[PDB]
Amino acid sequence: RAYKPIEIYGNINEVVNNVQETRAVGAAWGSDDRIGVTVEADEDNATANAVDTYINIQYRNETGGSFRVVNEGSTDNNIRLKGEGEFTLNAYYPYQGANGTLPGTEGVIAKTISGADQTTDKQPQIDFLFAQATGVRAESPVTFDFSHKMTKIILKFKATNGATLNNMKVYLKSLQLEGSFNVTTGEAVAKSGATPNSELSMDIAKPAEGEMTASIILFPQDMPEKVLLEVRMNDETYTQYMPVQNLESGHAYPYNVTFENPAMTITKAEIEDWIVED
Numbered sequence: 001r002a003y004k005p006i007e008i009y010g011n012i013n014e015v016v017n018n019v020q021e022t023r024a025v026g027a028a029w030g031s032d033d034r035i036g037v038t039v040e041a042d043e044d045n046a047t048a049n050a051v052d053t054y055i056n057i058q059y060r061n062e063t064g065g066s067f068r069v070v071n072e073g074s075t076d077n078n079i080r081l082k083g084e085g086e087f088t089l090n091a092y093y094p095y096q097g098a099n100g101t102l103p104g105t106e107g108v109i110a111k112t113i114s115g116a117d118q119t120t121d122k123q124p125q126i127d128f129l130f131a132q133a134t135g136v137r138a139e140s141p142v143t144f145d146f147s148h149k150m151t152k153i154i155l156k157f158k159a160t161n162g163a164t165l166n167n168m169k170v171y172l173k174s175l176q177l178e179g180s181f182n183v184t185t186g187e188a189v190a191k192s193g194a195t196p197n198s199e200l201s202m203d204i205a206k207p208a209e210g211e212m213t214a215s216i217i218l219f220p221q222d223m224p225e226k227v228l229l230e231v232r233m234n235d236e237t238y239t240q241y242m243p244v245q246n247l248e249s250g251h252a253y254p255y256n257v258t259f260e261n262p263a264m265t266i267t268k269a270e271i272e273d274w275i276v277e278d
């Protein structure tokens, strides 16, 4: 017989600033956000056609956390699970690749992070999310609970004792900028091996109102012992080494960068959950 499609929704686990709490939230998707959905396991049939056809199927955010399958031309790409058994499904964001095949190298997406990736427009393309849903039923709604698998550095700038904040050019040296995201397991990890001469740079504009901050999404990694922060501001160069730590998946690591006239100081703030810009 003809089996109806499954209906897909998505929550993202992150800090909601207006309530100051880590929550599952489905109202924080961008209007054209794309996810890839894979049927991992069919508990009734160990060697079924579902687990073979329904791999990396593209879905688009319709409104809220509600997703609709992407159909270009006269296609019907909906996932139609069959039977009364349970299924395991995986999902990830941002979608890439083709339907029926795992993206990258057997599900492993390689990427080299730069400062150009940290703009408003480009930072969502390296903000890798993963979800796994167990006990999924045929012809039913399923909600994926996505987690941010990357790590984040937040630089919070302040000026005291007569110093003034101006537009900056910020440099972070010796971080591991290359890494990979596995869409099958959700593991996001920086490549092994030290890269002491690596450099990430960004232009940070002095805002008209509020706090001046910079956020850097990176692959999770244990920072090397020496990470230099260089700031070019109002025709002056400030350099200071960072207090280093291990940068884990799903956490934000804020640093208080203060221009105390004349010194630029760096202190580590308390580890946070996934902080987003309001």
Ligand SMILES: [Cl-]
Pocket: 118, 119, 120, 121
């Ligand atoms: Cl920007």
Ligand SMILES: [Cl-]
Pocket: 160, 161, 162
């Ligand atoms: Cl002061």
Ligand SMILES: [Cl-]
Pocket: 244, 245, 246
């Ligand atoms: Cl640590």
Ligand SMILES: [Cl-]
Pocket: 243, 266, 267, 268
């Ligand atoms: Cl510190």
